[PDB]
Design a protein around this ligand. Structure first.
Ligand code: HEA
Ligand code: HEA
Ligand SMILES: CCCCCCCCCCCCCCCCCC(=O)O[C@@H](COC(=O)CCCCCCCCCCCCCCC)COP(=O)(O)OC[C@H](O)CO
Ligand SMILES: CCCCCCCCCCCCCCCCCC(=O)O[C@@H](COC(=O)CCCCCCCCCCCCCCC)COP(=O)(O)OC[C@H](O)CO
Ligand SMILES: CCCCCCCCCCCCCCCC(=O)OC[C@H](COP(=O)([O-])OCC[N+](C)(C)C)OC(=O)CCCCCCCCCCCCCCC
Ligand SMILES: CCCCCCCCCCCCCCCC(=O)OC[C@H](COP(=O)([O-])OCC[N+](C)(C)C)OC(=O)CCCCCCCCCCCCCCC
Ligand SMILES: CCCCCCCCCCCCCCCC(=O)OC[C@H](COP(=O)(O)OCCN)OC(=O)CCCCCCCCCCCCCCC
Ligand SMILES: CCCCCCCCCCCCCCCC(=O)OC[C@H](COP(=O)(O)OCCN)OC(=O)CCCCCCCCCCCCCCC
Ligand SMILES: CCCCCCCCCCCCCCCC(=O)OC[C@H](COP(=O)(O)OCCN)OC(=O)CCCCCCCCCCCCCCC
Ligand SMILES: [Cu+2]
Lengths: 40, 121, 47, 59, 534, 102, 133
């Protein structure tokens, strides 16, 4: 109820949505090492 | 083209018509006729209190609801005022736009404001 | 001095004109956008 | 005085630009401040006219 | 008909004219910076035949032009003279003659600086004019004198404008307005004007002293004759750092106004951070000397300077978190001001992070004058000034013109400048850690790929400027179409799930000032009645 | 400064005594829902009767779907379900059978 | 005014489109709906409820968001066109620049790297690869 539904997202923000944050910075690895490999 | 006594607070109109005669000998006269332009009217008004372009506050403390909405003494078509509560401050100021074409609302007081002309022939 | 409504006259240019329908003055603006560095280079060196 | 009132009446009865105040001064200044200004400005940037035509070409 | 554009007694014409002058200077600076980066695109002489003298001439032209004619005039003058005396309820601003004199002494500066840049000798010492680096022996001719005169006249113009703003704030306040609860923009302009009034005269005195040295051939700051140029170096620091505050704080006020009028919620700790900004303005005279750690000062002096420079750095994070709370719990719209403010705040967080990295004095020994310092201030100045000006324009164009601007063009413009800035500025970390040696026309070819990507980003920025001017043309030609259809944004803020269509139509904006619902700029006689507020 | 919240409620009822159109209903609903406080069934029924004083069923839809989606409040459903059920059965506003099957 | 079974072509014409219908009887239909709902609700039929919900709630006029019916594709392809213009103009200006390097070929860099990375306590032989042509 008040406690059971409180942890739906309170403790769920560490394993459910971290993929979004990880992919929000994934551009660096695909972009800059790719350019390094292309030029060198 | 005749001299004007200019003893009335409202009978003077036009700074050009006022010149101000000089003095031959004596002392500096009082701030009644030696001043040039229309500044003498303004300084007299600030000396006494009866003023044009008055900075006196309006009925800000009054709620100004439908029972007795606030008054604005100006013939200009537009209005630039504000009212966000009877006390000195309780919320962010929002401007009010009194007009005759439509009605106005306060969003905190819900006041319908009516612009107030000055009597004309 | 008090005859400006403030809809299209606020800009310090004249919209009217068949020789310059905001086409010649603005092309001059295009030219002067890159004119000063080009002439600065041209004075001492080549572009 | 006897001339300030007359000048004020003339200005009131005739509103014109340039203030109708310094006609001789205007004739001494503006045409001079045009012709002499051109005569003093143009030579400074017209001296390199002969040198003008630099293509930055060397052999 | 020409007195309106030559003897403008109204503030709005002067504001738009300053905007035009600043945008012209900015586009010229951007084009010539593109030329410079093309010269630095690849080592050698591909487009310019070496000419390191010419190289530093355009480098100093770049710096001086963008600092003195792009960031300064419009960003303060337009917003000040359009809001500060207008929102307070004043009828008309005073001192039109002073503003006209400032405008008409400006072309002296423009023409003199053009002549100084367009002489064979020229002045090319960069933004630093400390002798004997700025000596007449190397940079001969009249360039130094013309630069000094331009400095003097620009300082006079800015100081007189600040005086006018200050007297307007102090005297033209309406009866119904408390001083403690002034808006953040008013306090921002107040602090900026007072810091300018306390900073510009010192630099002006130093510049006059240098002019006397160059003319009368005396010995004050030359190394020969027992001179101390470090005095003028400290004067330039105590100008620039408060001048950095002058350039940034009005941007902070503009962002605060945007978020307050958009997010529909009050700014967290508004009065508390008004007091904090007042403290910043009062204490800015103590953190001006965190750049001279290597001149030869004592260790205790280094400790004092570093202690000050990281003890006055908290309010930056305070403002970051306050604006984060201001956008927290409210409604955020997919509008260009939102994204401009978000990008500006994010890149400012990285810039402040780099500055905090620079705050330490021990690390400065191996970090000073490396690439990291120039990367840091390019970060902070570039994003701050450029994004603040862009957000101001895209947030104020319907406020001053009333003709709507395309949403699609604005979004693609933002994306272009944003991607250009990111691709330019990301590799600077590697560039700093390697130690790219600054101000070299022919740098080692090791950084060739990074120079290539920097040139690509610069060219992206230049085509973005072309998009800017084309967007201006599109607005001028199709404002009526934008008003007719939905191709452009019509209302600043979207309604919430509480409002009926008619109610929102008759309550389109509930802001803290009448400017938003003030009709397109009226004639020179506006605000005929005082503003009443309770 | 954890100021009182019943003062704004009493302001809502005193404006209800001065209510003159649906505009005041919109204003009071926006002000009440803006606060962090969860409205009790009493004040919810007061807002509902204020909206029905002009007899505008779309305003009833507004207030009901606002109650359904006012505040996450750690995802409170069952209380919302029973509250919507009773505030529906008091008068009867069947609308969830139309927009949901879309 | 005191209508009966008011379910006409306008009621189901409202839902489809609103801007095409020429704004001169929008006021008439909304006034008629207001007059009808002034009377007791009596559980109005669904098309009238949907029409009044559409005319009172939004998703039209002011509620039209910045996200239009396919402008995001225009955003992405404007960015792509800008990038293509950038690369094309860079290529053409580089071609018009001409050759300006008589030294520092690949073999020059190879010789320099071999000279640097042959002695003097090399950090694992270095990684100074030649940049490009
Ligand atoms: C005001 C701060 C500022 C800003 C914004 C910039 C912006 C940039 N600077 Fe500069 N720079 C300095 C301050 C700044 N710089 C200083 C102090 C130096 C050292 C001086 C020296 O020692 O001499 C320096 C030096 C410097 C150098 C060293 C010169 C060398 O020796 O070769 C280089 C190298 O390329 C460089 C590059 C750039 C680039 C690519 C940008 C790009 O960010 C440019 C992008 C800018 C734009 C986006 C402008 C858009 C134009 C508009 C039309 C505006 C429209 C706005 C409205 C009016 C609505 N800068
Ligand atoms: C926009 C203007 C701006 C801003 C905001 C800053 C921010 C800072 N700057 Fe910088 N700086 C410049 C403009 C700016 N600087 C310029 C033009 C120069 C070049 C001048 C010259 O050297 O030539 C320069 C150079 C410069 C130097 C010169 C290096 C050397 O000696 O050569 C140093 C050295 O200490 C420094 C320090 C700092 C610090 C500590 C901050 C900090 O105030 C940053 C504040 C931000 C943070 C606080 C991080 C975000 C918030 C937090 C995470 C909160 C929690 C963290 C802490 C409180 C620890 N700056
Ligand atoms: C090599 C030649 C130059 C190419 C560079 C781009 C030049 C401009 C685009 C030329 C046409 C490209 C192919 C178009 C195919 C049909 C798509 C179409 O009909 O376009 C419309 C459909 O929109 C789209 O989805 C396309 C957007 C425009 C075209 C974008 C081109 C991108 C680059 C294409 C070539 C890339 C080649 C190299 C690959 C990287 C555009 O709408 P509008 O702008 O006319 O509508 C807006 C309104 O009329 C006025 O506001
Ligand atoms: C010497 C002149 C030679 C001719 C030049 C003609 C240029 C015409 C415009 C570009 C080529 C379009 C070819 C036809 C495409 C048709 C499909 C379409 O709709 O694409 C539109 C694509 O246009 C756009 O998307 C306009 C914006 C494109 C650019 C956006 C990003 C620009 C970023 C860089 C700007 C600065 C660049 C500087 C360096 C060059 C063009 O719309 P339209 O005006 O032809 O209307 C067609 C409509 O269906 C009615 O029939
Ligand atoms: C390799 C170097 C070149 C790298 C770059 C190469 C060129 C770019 C490649 C990726 C292009 C992605 C396009 C995304 C925008 C788009 O059009 O996506 C579609 C939806 C639109 O939203 P919708 O509601 O589905 O629209 C429906 C429209 N109908 C179908 C009814 C007509 O919109 C969405 O789904 C929005 C979410 C998608 C992501 C939006 C952010 C885009 C910017 C960041 C992209 C980062 C890079 C991604 C690709 C690697
Ligand atoms: C494996 C590689 C796959 C991709 C191959 C692409 C071509 C390439 O590698 O570059 C070839 C050269 C590079 O030329 P650059 O070194 O960048 O510039 C030199 C310009 N000059 C001095 C000749 C006037 O290109 C040139 O000299 C011509 C300019 C670029 C090509 C023209 C545009 C595209 C045409 C198709
Ligand atoms: C390559 C292929 C990529 C395919 C992507 C589309 C898949 C189908 C559509 C879909 O799944 O979209 C998933 C939903 C669909 O939102 P919506 O379409 O209902 O519109 C409703 C919202 N406007 O969120 C979105 O898109 C949100 C798009 C708007 C917000 C843009 C910024 C959000 C981050 C974008 C990405 C940033 C970089 C990555 C960071 C992790
Ligand atoms: C943005 C990153 C740019 C990196 C540039 C430096 C690395 C070189 C590189 O990455 O080269 C990778 C190539 C660059 O082709 P290019 O002609 O521009 O090379 C110029 C310098 N020699 O990519 C591509 O061909 C992508 C396709 C572009 C259009 C080709 C059309 C062919 C027909
Ligand atoms: C791998 C890298 C490839 C790079 C390619 C660069 C571009 C070169 C080819 C460009 C051709 C564009 C033709 C127009 C296609 C189009 O119109 O887009 C198709 C649709 C456009 O919907 P609409 O505008 O027709 O809706 C019209 C009414 N609003 O958008 C999308 O579905 C976006 C999602 C794509 C996934
Ligand atoms: Cu500092």
């Amino acid at each position: 109820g008040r406690i059971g539904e409180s942890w739906v997202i309170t403790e769920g923000r560490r394993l459910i949505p971290e993929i979004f944050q990880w992919s929000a910075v994934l551009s660096v690895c695909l972009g800059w090492p790719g350019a390094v490999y292309f030029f060198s | 083209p005749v001299v004007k006594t200019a003893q009335n607070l409202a009978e003077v109109n036009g700074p050009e018509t006022l010149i101000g005669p000089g003095a031959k000998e004596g002392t500096v006269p009082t701030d009644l006729d030696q001043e040039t332009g229309l500044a003498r009217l303004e300084l007299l008004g600030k000396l006494e209190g009866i003023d044009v372009f008055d900075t006196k506050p309006l009925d800000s403390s009054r709620k100004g609801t439908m029972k007795d909405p606030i008054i604005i003494e100006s013939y200009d078509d537009y209005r630039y005022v504000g009212c966000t509560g009877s006390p000195a401050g309780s919320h962010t100021i929002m401007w009010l736009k009194p007009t005759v074409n439509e009605v106005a609302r306060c969003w905190e007081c819900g006041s319908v404001y009516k612009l107030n002309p000055v009597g004309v022939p | 001095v008090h005859f400006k409504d403030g809809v299209y006259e606020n800009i310090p240019f004249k919209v009217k004109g068949r020789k310059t329908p905001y086409a010649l003055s603005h092309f001059g603006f295009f030219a002067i956008g890159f004119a000063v560095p080009f002439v600065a280079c041209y004075v001492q060196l080549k572009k | 005085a006897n001339k300030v009132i007359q000048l004020q009446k003339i200005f009131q009865s005739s509103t014109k630009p340039l203030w109708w105040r310094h006609p001789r001064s205007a004739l001494y200044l503006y045409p001079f401040y045009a012709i002499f200004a051109v005569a003093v400005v143009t030579p400074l940037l017209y001296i390199p006219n002969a040198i003008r035509g630099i293509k930055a070409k060397k052999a | 008909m020409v007195q309106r554009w030559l003897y403008s007694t109204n503030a709005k014409d002067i504001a738009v004219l300053y905007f035009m002058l600043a945008i012209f200077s900015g586009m010229a600076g951007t084009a010539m910076s593109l030329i410079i980066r093309l010269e630095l695109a690849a080592p050698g002489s591909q487009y310019l035949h070496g000419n390191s003298q010419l190289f530093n001439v355009l480098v100093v032209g770049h710096a001086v032009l963008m600092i003195f004619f792009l960031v300064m005039p419009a960003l303060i003058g337009g917003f000040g003279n359009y809001l500060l005396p207008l929102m307070i309820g004043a009828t008309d601003t005073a001192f039109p003659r002073i503003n006209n004199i400032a405008f008409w002494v400006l072309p002296m500066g423009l023409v003199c600086l053009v002549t100084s840049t367009l002489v064979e000798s020229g002045a090319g010492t960069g933004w630093t004019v400390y002798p004997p680096l700025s000596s007449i022996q190397a940079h001969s001719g009249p360039s130094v004198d013309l630069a000094i005169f331009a400095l003097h006249l620009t300082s006079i113009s800015s100081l007189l404008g600040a005086i006018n703003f200050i007297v307007t704030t102090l005297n033209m306040r309406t009866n119904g307005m408390t001083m403690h609860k002034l808006p953040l923009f008013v306090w921002s302009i107040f602090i900026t004007a007072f810091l300018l009034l306390l900073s510009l005269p010192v630099l002006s005195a130093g510049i006059t002293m240098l002019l006397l040295d160059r003319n009368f051939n005396t010995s004050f700051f030359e190394v020969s004759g027992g001179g101390d140029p470090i005095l003028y170096e400290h004067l330039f620091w105590f100008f620039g750092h408060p001048e950095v505050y002058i350039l940034i704080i009005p941007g902070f006020g503009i962002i605060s106004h945007v978020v307050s009028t958009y997010s529909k919620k009050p700014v967290f700790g508004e009065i508390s951070m008004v007091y904090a900004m007042a403290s910043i303005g009062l204490l800015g005279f103590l953190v001006w000397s965190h750049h001279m750690y290597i001149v030869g000062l004592d260790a205790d002096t280094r400790a004092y300077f570093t202690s000050a420079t990281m003890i006055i750095a908290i309010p930056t994070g305070i403002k970051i978190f306050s604006w984060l709370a201001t956008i927290h719990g409210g409604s955020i719209r997919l509008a260009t001001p939102m994204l401009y403010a978000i990008a500006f705040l994010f890149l400012f967080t990285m810039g402040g992070l780099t500055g905090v990295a620079l705050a330490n004095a021990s690390l400065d020994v191996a970090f000073h004058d490396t690439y990291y310092v120039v990367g840091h201030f390019h970060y902070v100045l570039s994003m701050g000034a450029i994004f603040s000006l862009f957000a101001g324009y895209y947030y104020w164009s319907p406020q001053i013109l009333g003709l709507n601007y395309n949403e699609k063009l604005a979004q693609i413009q933002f994306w272009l400048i944003f991607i250009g800035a990111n691709v330019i500025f990301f590799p600077m970390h590697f560039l700093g850690i390697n130690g790219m040696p600054r101000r070299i026309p022919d740098y080692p070819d090791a950084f060739a790929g990074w120079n290539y990507v920097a040139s690509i980003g610069s060219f992206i920025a230049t085509l973005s400027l072309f998009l800017f001017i084309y967007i201006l043309y599109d607005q001028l030609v199709n404002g009526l179409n934008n008003k007719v259809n939905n191709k452009s944004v019509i209302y600043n803020k979207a309604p919430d799930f509480v409002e009926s269509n008619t109610i929102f139509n008759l309550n389109t904006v509930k802001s803290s000032s009448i400017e938003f619902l003030l009709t397109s700029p009226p004639a020179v006689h506006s605000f005929n009645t005082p503003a009443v507020q309770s | 400064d954890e100021e009182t919240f019943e003062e704004f409620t009493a302001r809502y009822e005193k404006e209800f005594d001065e209510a003159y159109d649906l505009f005041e209903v919109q204003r009071v609903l926006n002000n009440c829902f803006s606060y962090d406080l969860v409205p009790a069934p009493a004040v919810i029924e007061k807002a509902l009767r204020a909206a029905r004083r002009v007899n505008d069923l779309p305003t009833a839809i507004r207030v009901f779907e606002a109650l359904k989606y006012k505040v996450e409040n750690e995802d409170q459903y069952k209380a919302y379900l029973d509250e919507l059920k009773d505030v529906r059965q008091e008068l009867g506003v069947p609308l969830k059978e139309e927009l949901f099957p879309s | 005014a005191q209508t009966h079974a008011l379910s006409n072509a306008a009621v189901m014409d409202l839902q489809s489109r609103w801007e095409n219908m020429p704004s001169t009887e929008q006021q008439d239909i909304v006034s008629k709906l207001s007059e009808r709902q002034k009377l007791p609700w009596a559980q109005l039929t669904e098309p009238e409820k949907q029409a009044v919900w559409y005319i009172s709630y939004g998703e039209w006029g002011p509620r039209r968001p910045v996200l239009n019916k396919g402008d995001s594709s225009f955003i992405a392809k404007g960015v792509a066109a800008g990038l293509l213009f950038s690369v094309g103009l860079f290529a053409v200006v580089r071609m018009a620049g001409g050759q300006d390097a008589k030294t520092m070929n690949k073999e020059w860099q190879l010789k320099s790297d071999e000279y640097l990375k042959s002695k003097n306590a090399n950090p694992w032989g270095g990684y100074s690869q030649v940049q490009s042509k």
